[model samples]
Each structure stands twice: as structure tokens, then as C-alpha cells.
Target: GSPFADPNSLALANVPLSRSKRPDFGQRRIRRPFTVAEVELLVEAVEHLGTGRWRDVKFRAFENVHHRTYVDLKDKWKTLVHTASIAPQQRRGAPVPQELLDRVLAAQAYWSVDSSGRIVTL
Candidate 1:
């Protein structure tokens, strides 16, 4: 899909997908800027990524926007106000939840047990 459409702009689906041949847009390939509508759509889709659980984030707008393209744009916007709208802030490192820690303790057969019935490794 063409993330950068014509300056005058046309529907993405209407853009010819003839890979065997290329259409003559122009000789100079200056990056086509995103229109306000396209930017709004992309921003909306990206914002939706953090709305629900990461696993449950099935953004409909993401279905339309290419993943790689969005990532590139997000990297470009890292220092800008649009960055906040583009991606959710997350921990810098891996997070181990308490439930996972509890499960690990439960799996050890030779560990000691406290009065509370929790496992203890001496």
C-alpha cells in the first residue's frame, strides 16, 4: 500500500498495484507529505494501540495502516508532541508480574515452606 499518496491525493485502493510496471509520478521522489486526513487516521490508529491490553489491541485503523510505516513514523516523531499520540509509553525493561513470581515459587518441589504456606528457599 502507498503510505505516501499523490499530493493531490487519491484513494489507496484506487492506486494501481501493478508491480510488473511502474506509474510515472515524477522524476524527483521527494517524500510526499501526509495530508491532514491521513495523519488524523494514522494518529487515531496508533493511539488505539494502548487503549486495551497489548494483546487485545486490535486497532481497526492499524488494519489499514502498514505496521512498518507506522513504526518509521513513530521513530521520526520521538521528540515531537505527536510522539505522545503515536505510541504508548512503556517500561524500558522487561516486567515480571507478581503472579508469575508466585507461579515460579509454586513449581519448586524442594523449597521450604513458611507458616503462611508460601515457599521459601534457604
Candidate 2:
């Protein structure tokens, strides 16, 4: 179960809690991107916990990585899965290991859970 699952569980605060905000014209915050090591850990978390348990996965794997939120983790998983599906020549950025991609496909196929937490076929 998610600790923040219930909307009323946490007290309201005046400060903005979002990582992203509107940038001034020609000004952008440099994104502190996730590393391959982090993605490896994320995949490890996903494999251990199954899908649809991102909160647990976050707590289990990324608790030490302060910049990363559960939402970030969830988003990365989506990107990873998409990256896995495409041809290697079609992919951009640093390459993800095919072994890891295979694990992603296998995990998603077994759990039938997508980023939206809905059932999907591989």
C-alpha cells in the first residue's frame, strides 16, 4: 500500500512540492538525469517487486537518491520499456543493455502491467 495513497494522509503545506516549474524565457534548469547504475537498480527493483508497486520499488531501490521521485521512477520505466521495444539503430542517447531490455519485456509480459497500471500484451 502507498503511504501517500490516501489524499488526506499528509498535511497541506504552502510551499510548492513540484520538481518542475515554469522557466523564465531562455532559462532552463539543467536536468540532473538518471544514470545507468540507477536504471539498473530500478530494473532490479521492478523484478523483485513485480509491476504496479512503484511506491515499494521507490522505497526499496531509490530511497537514497533524493532527486528522484516515484513519479520520476515511473516515467523512466515507461521510457525504458519503449526503448527496449525499438530497434537499436532507432534509439537515442546512451544505449540500454539488451539483457536488461529482455528482462523488462519478460517482466512486463509476466505481470501484464504497463505504466498506466492497465493490462497490456507484449
lDDT of 2 by residue, 92-117 (tens): 43545667777776777667744433
Tens-digit lDDT track of model 1 for 16-121: 5555764322122223344444444444443444223332222444554554454544432222222222223421112424332232233221232322255577
lDDT of each: 0.36, 0.65
- Highest TM-score model number: 2
Count of clashes in candidate 2? 0
Relative to the unseen true structure, what is the Cα RMSD of model 1?
A: 26.3
Candidate no. 1 TM-score: 0.26
Which candidate number would show the highest lDDT if scored against the true structure?
A: 2
**Which residue pairs show collisions in model 1?**
none
Regions of candidate 1 where Cα sits further than 4 Å from its true position: 1-32, 50-59, 65-70, 76-122
Residue 67 CA error for candidate 1 (Å)?
Answer: 6.7
Give candidates' CA RMSD values in order.
26.3, 17.9
